[PDB]
Design a protein around this ligand. Sequence first.
Ligand SMILES: *[C@H](C)[C@H]1/C(=C/c2[nH]c(/C=C3N=C(/C=C4\NC(=O)C(CC)=C4C)C(C)=C\3CCC(=O)O)c(CCC(=O)O)c2C)NC(=O)[C@@H]1C
Ligand SMILES: *[C@H](C)[C@H]1/C(=C/c2[nH]c(/C=C3N=C(/C=C4\NC(=O)C(CC)=C4C)C(C)=C\3CCC(=O)O)c(CCC(=O)O)c2C)NC(=O)[C@@H]1C
Ligand SMILES: N[C@@H](CCC(=O)O)C(=O)O
Lengths: 381, 377
Amino acid sequence: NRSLEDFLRNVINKFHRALTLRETLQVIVEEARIFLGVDRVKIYKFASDGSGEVLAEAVNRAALPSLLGLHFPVEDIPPQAREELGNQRKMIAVDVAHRRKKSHELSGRISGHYTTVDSCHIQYLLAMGVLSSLTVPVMQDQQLWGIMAVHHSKPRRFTEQEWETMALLSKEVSLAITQSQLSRQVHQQQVQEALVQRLETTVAQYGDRPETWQYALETVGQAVEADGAVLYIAPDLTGSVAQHYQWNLRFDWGNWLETSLWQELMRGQPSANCVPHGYTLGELEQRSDWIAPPESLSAENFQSFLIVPLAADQQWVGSLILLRKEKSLVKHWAGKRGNILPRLSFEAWEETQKLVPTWNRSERKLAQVASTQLYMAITQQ
Amino acid sequence: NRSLEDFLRNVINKFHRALTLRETLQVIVEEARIFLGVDRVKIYKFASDGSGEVLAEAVNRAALPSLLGLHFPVEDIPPQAREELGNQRKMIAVDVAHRRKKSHELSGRIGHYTTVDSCHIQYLLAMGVLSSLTVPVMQDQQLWGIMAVHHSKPRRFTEQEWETMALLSKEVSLAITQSQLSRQVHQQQVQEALVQRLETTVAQYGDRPETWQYALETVGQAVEADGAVLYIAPDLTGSVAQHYQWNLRFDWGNWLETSLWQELMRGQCVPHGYTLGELEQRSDWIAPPESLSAENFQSFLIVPLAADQQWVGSLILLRKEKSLVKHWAGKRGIDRRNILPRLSFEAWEETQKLVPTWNRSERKLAQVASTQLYMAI
Ligand SMILES: *[C@H](C)[C@H]1/C(=C/c2[nH]c(/C=C3N=C(/C=C4\NC(=O)C(CC)=C4C)C(C)=C\3CCC(=O)O)c(CCC(=O)O)c2C)NC(=O)[C@@H]1C
Ligand SMILES: *[C@H](C)[C@H]1/C(=C/c2[nH]c(/C=C3N=C(/C=C4\NC(=O)C(CC)=C4C)C(C)=C\3CCC(=O)O)c(CCC(=O)O)c2C)NC(=O)[C@@H]1C
Ligand SMILES: N[C@@H](CCC(=O)O)C(=O)O
């Protein structure tokens, strides 16, 4: 007999009333650095393409540089090393001055063997001013989420007491990542429900008037974090012209929406139940029925479209159109990357990248739930 | 630059100060029952043998009975059901009155029915249950247990409720991980505090024989043994074969000189476990007096204090037979357990006898203390 909105709030109040993920990573590296008495302890998180970022860092600035916020390319860690770190779950200790390494299991020991290090990784570590390195794999969903990096500018051997402690801290990071990922999912459930309740109240208050649909559309566009949005309402029983509503736009899509192109698009039909389908601008232009929009239309940098038909079997009543502009992202890399020899400079290199917007799992679900509500509201609930 | 003792206490203070595992399961089931408005929500944890226990429960007592603390046997949940819940991670809903079921993925979210086996139908009817939702609880990609949602009346669960239960299952899984990691850190302190306790008694209390008695009781308490034996091999040419005892009635001075224990205290500092049944079936086996066997020691953890060449002593950690009592939900038959379901789930109390084992934490701890003593004398 308790509402969902009240229930989700109780989950966070009791199970997710903690610190953020970033703040937790920061606490962990500082405790490791003090306990080890080393120059630098970092936490590095892989991206999908194998590259990564330094998310947390405790560092003696007099001894080592700060790599916080810097990105490293995929080639820095070759498949051989990733295999040993992830699938074998090996912590790796590199003794630079003697060009040797050793591996201990992240799991346990129940009881060291030295191996010669490749000359590239030796120069690499030298270029960093590092003579002692301990790489600790961070696991999540049986995958290498990233590493914990312990660096010292002087020769430094680690006792087993220190191995086990870093292995323990690795599980703490894994714990926090799990915590943060679940708290994210709960919060997405709150946003979903808050959108539904807001839409229901809007209709109950205003009814079947343009103010309802204008307010509802931009409420949805804001929840799904789009850059712009359009709600199209088809002619009802015995004809009722056509209604369209816009948010964060500049020109009237009214005439453009009546095009053969958009009538097919809004229904989710190719030829060129509220299942949202994503599109890029470059894909729509390749349609056989593609008709160019006005001049000051394509200059708004709108590149990503999420079109959701307002339908239910033999009943199509309209469509929800969510838009996203091309975004410019800045990444600071450690040295100039963009082969056989390692780079010997790790200075901050700035790069700007025009990324094509994507509609993730949560946003697509949110758009589905939103359009479903819109369908039920249009057919007079 | 920091000691280990200070570090581990900071880890617990900063990451492990919250509700216990038991308290969290009880919070979770109570929120689930109130939210769903059903008669009973339970959390059920599997043992290694396939059986399980109702750890937490929220129940409308005027609608359904209480199963809190009760054990259910392995036969109740057949291999195929464990496969669906575990490796396939299926949430299973049973509509008893129509003898049908539908399955949904624990993580899948964006409706088909199948006939339920007649046995599981009788089973749920015997419980007074007409509507059931079984949600797998995972840990390390293994089926840790289930969350059981039971209603006496027919009840179809909406999509919003499926996701919500799935979310609570992830919450349970999180609390389990936190609990286990909290246990590891605590066992790290026990191992640490043992060492510092010994070292304060080594370089300060001299080489008095009273030290080997205090270290024996300190280690014995840390490993939570019922009795401890420290055997000192003859020193140099021919000193004296000594032995210290803790919580040991009779004197094992004679039995230790036997080739039975002489071979056991030399391996063949890695700890190794033995049950009494193993010793009795040994080709090398000589019986002890009745006064020694009257204490009923069944589990032996022998840790040879040696480094290849030099073998100066051996550590023997002992545990008596344990008696565990189980409250089975209904009386189990002597045979034909997979043939017919029980129709009565009244608490049947059975006492069990078992030989205690030595887990990874205790064997690691026994190894730490043993090496600590080897370098001592
Ligand atoms: C040589 C042309 C190329 C190359 C090869 C290479 N790398 C490794 C091992 C590792 N390199 C890293 C990189 C990092 N360590 C860090 O701390 C950070 C920042 C947080 C980065 C980006 C890691 C983690 C490993 C694995 C663990 C280790 O310490 O070795 C090897 C293997 C070494 C060996 O054989 O012993 C090789 C061959 N590195 C380059 O940059 C070139 C492109
Ligand atoms: C028949 C002779 C034997 C038998 C077989 C059987 N069981 C199932 C399905 C399940 N049975 C359980 C048991 C429990 N449910 C609970 O809620 C609790 C907590 C107190 C227990 C111990 C579970 C979890 C399942 C799986 C999920 C489900 O609801 O189905 C089946 C499969 C049913 C099917 O056809 O799908 C079968 C064949 N059960 C017996 O007890 C007999 C000894
Ligand atoms: N060797 C794999 C990674 C294996 C792992 O994740 O453990 C790679 O380079 O992508």
